[PDB]
Amino acid sequence: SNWWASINRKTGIRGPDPAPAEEHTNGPARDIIGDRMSRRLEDINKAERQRVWDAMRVAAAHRYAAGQMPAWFDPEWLQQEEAPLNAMDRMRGEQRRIGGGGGGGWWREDDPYWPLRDWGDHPMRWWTLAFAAIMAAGGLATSVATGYVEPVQAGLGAGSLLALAGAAMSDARCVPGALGVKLAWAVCALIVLKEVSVGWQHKRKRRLAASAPRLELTGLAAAALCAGYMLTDMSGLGEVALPPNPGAVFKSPDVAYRASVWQKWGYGQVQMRV
Amino acid sequence: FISPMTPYVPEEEPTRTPPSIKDTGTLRPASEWYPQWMQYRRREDNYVFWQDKFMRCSTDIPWAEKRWTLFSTVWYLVQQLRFVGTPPALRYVAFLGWRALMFQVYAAHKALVLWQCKLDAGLARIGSGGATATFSKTMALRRLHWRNSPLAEALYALNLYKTGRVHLLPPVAKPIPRPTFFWLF
Amino acid sequence: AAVAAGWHLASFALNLAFWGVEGMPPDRYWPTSPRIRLQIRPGRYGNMDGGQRVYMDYLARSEGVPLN
């Protein structure tokens, strides 16, 4: 209401609204480059620090097992999984901001979705341990009942491997966990392959159509375990694959890597012209 | 030693490419070329539609998808027969047929999700007497977007059937990582 | 005989649905020229000045123009 007619160029020009808002800085550099690139730079720095810490503890492990470490080294530091700087940054963020397996079990009273909690083990650990138990028991019982030795040899022999895989899958955040899930998948895939290709010797019958290798309950259970491994977790040890071709490194920006693949694949002396 | 409250969750490298910016996530076919939300965004901020094609197919390929294995060696033949071995005309008519079939299966899944909402209300009445008879719309969208594991579905259904508690939901299922077995796949 | 001719006609119709070049990416292993694919260059023996005239006439006939 006539807030004009008092607008002075000498005493300062002001509107009726008392100032727009405050100003948020979040750092001079982050003012300079903005977000989505401060975030990208922060993620790159965090990932590189974690990679450097993992490489440092692997190399320190290799040197401490060699007895080539100074006297101040504590091997318990190798149990520090996170990078120390990233751990400090997460402390800063959190300080400026604020049926009976696997774990426990509550059964329709409190914490109803307790099986989905991360207990530290693979989801298929009790499944592969139960399959090992029923395979060993069924093989022993079949060999006792019939006299064929393929049920006990392909019974307890695979059950021990599945039990070792289930032991290795009790901490499914490590190289033993990845190796255990791969070994369990290999054993179950071998069971499925034998069942649907060769068959079971004690199931040999008179007629050729009665022999019929087929896919019975054991092969179904092993294939279901295989699908369970694939659909829960198998990633890990993905660095183990076939060696890279010269077709991978044709457009690679690394002359040294391209020449290494060139020399390893027998070419070697072909002119690079890059 | 430097334990930061929350137990350190190791952040492994991604094994699958992130889903495209034109995706729906609901088994419905995506749009033909343009994902139709760009018209509700400003121009020259829709630059991230081609910045999804880049870094989904050129610059941010996960190294788990560049692995050379026997299965990928076999699968290159299927992809080569699909792309350079089959005419684009037949590929186009098969693409139209798959689009129509996927629309039909999306309508079927939507009707199934609505019936699962009705079953949610029924199980929430049998278990809380007659008081709670609603259903969780967030869980309805979670079923529609395939964010639930079968174990989570069974646990939630059992939870409704014997204590009620519609708005107490199971955790969202993590994406399935790409399986790797050495040189095999 | 109709079944055999129908198989041949199905192959020909598949090639017709292929039609041209559209839908196919360029290939660095298979360029469109065999001289690119192999390593074939003219050198000191064989090339002569008149060969430019003959090359011009062959290229005119290959392009389809009756000029030389």
């Binding site: 649907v196 290709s197 | 033949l77 299927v78 027969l81 | 298979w30």
Partner: peptide, 29 residues
């Protein structure tokens, strides 16, 4: 099992190798 399962990758590989071999036969001619 295995009937049209150990055949389809092998027939796929044979078709691909045969086509590349015809192209390379043109190349060597």
């Amino acid at each position: 099992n295995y009937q049209k399962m150990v055949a389809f990758p092998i027939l796929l590989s044979l078709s691909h190798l045969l086509h590349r071999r015809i192209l390379y036969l043109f190349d060597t001619l």
